[PDB]
């Protein structure tokens, strides 16, 4: 009873006002050592997803 919001997912993904899902760029915390200024910058911005977007929607639903 009462779907429980997947806290593990909410703490890391916010949904757009429209219906899209957005999250930070992966690989930017550990692998780093001396990557091109492009990489580190490209990794700075968030992004949209595709199919699994619908998947992660079915979690933060009550949210």
């Amino acid at each position: 009873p009462k779907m429980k919001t997947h806290k593990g997912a909410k703490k890391r993904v916010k949904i757009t006002a429209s219906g899209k899902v957005v999250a930070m760029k992966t690989g930017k915390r550990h692998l780093n050592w001396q990557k091109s200024g492009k990489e580190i910058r490209q990794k700075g911005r968030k992004f949209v997803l595709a199919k699994p977007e619908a998947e992660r929607i079915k979690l933060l639903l009550p949210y």
Binding site: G8, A9, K11, R12, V13, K14, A23, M24, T26, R29, P52, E55, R56
Partner: peptide
């Protein structure tokens, strides 16, 4: 799982 993503969200808890 696609759980490879990560949490930038600060203040997530206290």
């Amino acid at each position: 799982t696609t759980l490879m993503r990560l949490p930038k969200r600060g203040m997530q808890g206290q």
